[PDB]
Symmetry: D3
């Protein structure tokens, strides 16, 4: 029946999707982010794509999981774009590339090394993956007001942390001053920008670079997730 | 508690995982494949990873979804490997690159163009992505016995079907004789082989190269999925 | 005699150079920028490097020409770095890559395509060339207050506008949404960042993408140069 | 006179060439292979190309030397193709990349690393160089019946074993699990497949990875050559 | 017996090989070149390698065929080097890339496009393939004295003239001003130089770029071969 | 007024520029070279471009500085070409890549490694950067007659001697037998040749590979500059 008008992966349309969007890897994180919003509604659920609308401080925002990886991210960006998204903020996870960065502290990517094939499918790797400065301004301002430590800088996005060369990759990138590594940021920044989106990425640190420990760690991380979501929500509701 | 011994993404361990494994993109396909098996048990559910064991014609086999894309595939291969997998068969979806291939017909990848960054993270693209011939032999033999049309040959694996150049990519690859395109096969074939797995990929055609139509199409596709799963099950239970 | 302590190309030392620096292509532009400052002093003059200190609204700033091209830019960045520079702003020239951009209007590079070999000597082209957001914030704020049109976005930096393929390069990059093209920005952004500098680039448009005309054009361009210099000065004197 | 209809390098035509073909490096090996056949006839002799027809167990097969290297291999593949070849099997020599492989033991290439420029002239190195499984099936079956040890897997094809880096190349490829190295296999597999041939490669080991010794070694190698030829003949006469 | 001291492919040793060497593709050309010399002796015959010594105007020179292609050329260069060669001149065949060049006219390669994988195995393609100027001087001087037309400039060396893109390759390279194309020159120039040889290449045109005709063409070509050989001999006997 | 007919960077036209040209990096070197000539006239002065005509032994020659780097070199080559230049000789500076080469000794580049992006903008790096042999002949002949040591061979042209990897670059290139390194030679050789110029490069050594010392060093270097200029002048006035 109504299977003609919907985007084939995110399963939503023009009218459903807000111009303002948050994406994350984990479908179950979508339910956690909507907890913070009013007037929540499930829009679609398909494969790794879980899509909700919610209202935060008066502004209607769409929350969308995209699974792990640049290809699954790019699929959601293209289809969100077609539904009228203009501002998209990644809220995600990272492994630290500097030893001073603790669990549940935030990395805000100003730029990203394009070490994933996803963005390369579109354009020469020479094209920059960077965050919209208007969004960065707002993110910086929200994060200043609170106590959890956060770092602005370059992250690396890649397609595997499981090569035998992971150690050396880490060390090389540590010396270049990269803050953290994910799989999705540079693809958002590249494809998003090429489709005229304003984009940004707020990453929760979940691996150190280096029983009761476990519980505090998990709490720290869960606190970082919440902060990252709130920061993204605070930023989008100003536009 | 018991969060020390499990693989951090597939959330299973050595003892749970069979040496014989089927992977697919869609978590909901895992439930559909287990329908065909005895002694089914849910092993884990995490992000896009849905993991089950089942028994088919006496052999215990593990079924695992890996979401869409090479990075999420590679994560599952590495972790399945560490749990003792030896034979892994992709059961997935493809877009046709030749016009004679119909919906719900199967493409069996003998080889795959490595147009995804995932496999490139591991090794120079010059290394071949090809299917284990023992598995190909068995797949060919099962498929001969039945009526649904199937094609053996080269597929292309890539990170985006949404570039502005998709048309030209299609036409170029059509002329080279590629049968279909997916996102995951060449990564399985490359990483899998480099970790000593026997690997294969059986792909269900879901896009032509070119209301009642819709219902028969869906039936055709659902029939192709079932055939692909059965073929993989028949192949693995012989080892 | 005192030819031991000075940088071998910019011919200045630690004590001479301010942490705050403006660089431009043309040595004669250095004299034009110092016209706008108090307490001017010639520091060095060597090859294409013309170096001055001046004071603007209380802040001491160094002005340095670097000739044309990424290699000559990189030489000045490395040596300015060694003399203690922390903030460096390019004030330069561009050819428009969109037809709405007029002569003597400004392009502020948020990011830059790394199509020059200079930055590639240092690091894989996958590393992002982008502008420090703190500087971008300040530049945006100054430029809002006045009437001359200015555009924020991506520029392309390259090593030749004289290949037979220039037309096609232009058209390709026009469609990607690039605003202008220079030879120096992405090298500043890449090497500068890798040496821990805060960096930015304000470019004066001097070629349309498309006697009395000539005089107004020149006036427009000279007005853009002055505005670009003033904007950079206003930005640096706040740090 | 009749110098219009013949292929300019292999000096044969449509009518002469069988659909079933064996190629080898060494012209003098052609005479050794025909020793095993009935109804032998010299077809052509030109540069490194020595061409014969023979009959084996009822089937007429063409034997063709192609000298050393991918370019000279590719020339023979293109021209054999134009003469109506459909199945082509390389029967050649390899240097071992694992220490358990002895002299005069066989390596059957399922796939090949495309480290030669020959195949790259045709297509991106991402395209797979692999052997036709129907041929692999048959080769496996013949070789099972006899006592000489043989290994199935990946070989590396390259353009020089004389670079100063040969040692490190060897060690790198040894760890990746490559069985042996030649100069011709991946070019056959790539160009052959792109021209719609069924292809395979059976390689005789002639260098260990590590007077009376010399005589037994030579005998071992000569025995491997004979076995490789017989295996290829047994395989082709079944089609 | 004496199978320990000889180079494994060219089957000659230190004492046999002159410092001055001519190489060509075709073994039968070796017999044609020795026709022009005194005190001829067959040194070795192995695969595509046919090796002779002869004396020309007092100087002893070695003549060696290397079959077709860069890999087989490189093998002979490495082994000739080890036997004490210092000056090596290619005497070969080319296809014209400009329409004014006739059959049996000579192309003398000053430089060569490195479009073959052979030289790339050794060193980045950025390293120049060019001819020793001392040899070029002497070649120019001999050729001035006679009537057959000859052209000095850039040739292209490649691994296949049989790709579907040959036409476009030709046209692209024609416009760049390339004179002719072979398979071997840039490999000689690159590997040779890296091993400290003085190198040069004199190529006989055998394909236009565009019964009685056939006979005059063949005569023209055979005349070009003779001239090329004589020119190389005249050049080497001066050292 | 007369700002229509002049080249936009070198600020000269067809009638001003001689077919015979010397280029150097340093504008102040132009004044030093004209000291050696009769009938000197300043033609233009713009940015790093300082342009003069002079007469040497009857021949009128143009002297042009091009600042440091391949992009600024290429600009001058293109515009000199358009003004009718046919023969262009670089007279420049190098850092030694072999320890036997002393300060103020000359390196004459027969060929150049294309490690700069400038030439790559035009053509695949596989195209050779080499010197016109007619010019090399003449340069060799002049330099034989005098006492200062000079070396003919390969140089490397690059875009930065300030990467953290400079040491290793040096060592790698030392072993390959490179004589010296500059920033401009391979760009002249590549772009120049592609525009049909006869080209050459004579480089003065100013850095060893390894008060009174300082004065003799400077004298040695200044003597090398003079010799290089004279050699170029002697060479051009013969055409």
């Amino acid at each position: 029946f109504q299977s003609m008008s919907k985007q084939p992966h995110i399963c939503v349309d023009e009218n459903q999707v807000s111009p303002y969007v948050i994406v994350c890897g984990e479908p179950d994180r979508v339910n956690r982010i909507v907890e913070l919003m009013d007037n929540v509604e499930l829009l679609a659920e398909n494969r790794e794509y879980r899509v909700f609308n919610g209202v935060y401080k008066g502004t209607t925002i769409t929350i969308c999981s995209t699974g792990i990886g640049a290809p699954s991210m790019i699929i959601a960006v293209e289809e969100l774009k077609l539904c009228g998204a203009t501002h998209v903020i990644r809220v995600g996870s990272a492994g630290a590339m500097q030893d001073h960065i603790q669990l549940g502290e935030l990395i805000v990517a100003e730029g990203a090394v394009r070490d994933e094939g996803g963005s390369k499918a579109y354009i020469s790797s020479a094209y920059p993956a960077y965050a919209s400065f208007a969004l960065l301004k707002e993110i910086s301002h929200f994060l200043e007001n609170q106590s959890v430590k956060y770092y602005f800088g370059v992250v690396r996005s890649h397609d595997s942390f499981y090569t035998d060369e992971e150690d050396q990759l880490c060390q090389y990138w540590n010396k270049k001053g990269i803050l953290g590594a994910d799989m999705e940021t540079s693809a958002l920044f590249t494809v998003g920008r090429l489709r005229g989106l304003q984009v940004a990425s707020i990453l929760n640190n979940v691996v150190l670079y280096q029983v009761n420990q476990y519980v505090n760690d998990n709490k720290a991380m869960m606190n970082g997730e919440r902060l990252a979501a709130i920061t993204a929500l605070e930023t989008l509701c100003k536009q």
